[PDB]
Amino acid sequence: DYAGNLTRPHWGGAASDVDIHLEVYQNEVDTRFQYQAMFLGLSSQRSVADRS
Amino acid sequence: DYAGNLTRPHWGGAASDVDIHLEVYQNEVDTRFQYQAMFLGLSSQRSVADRS
């Protein structure tokens, strides 16, 4: 193309070849897939908070 | 961690490790699974009662 030496704003380099852009970030974290316990209703519950 | 000698309340013995803890008991007795006779309509009933 014509004008093979042009101005690239966030491509700061000696020949304007190396990227220097900014990573846009929207506070996104991918951690894991959540799990819910399912033996709360399939077993009896007792408390020994005194006779430990 | 930093205390291999501790004060365990309901552990008796000279160097603890006796487990004299109380037993929590809620009046529960598991006995067996009951059975009901079915040979009532599967036979003929004759009552000798108080005669022979």
From TrEMBL, chains A, B:
Highest taxon in the source lineage: Viruses
Name of this chain's protein: Putative capsid protein
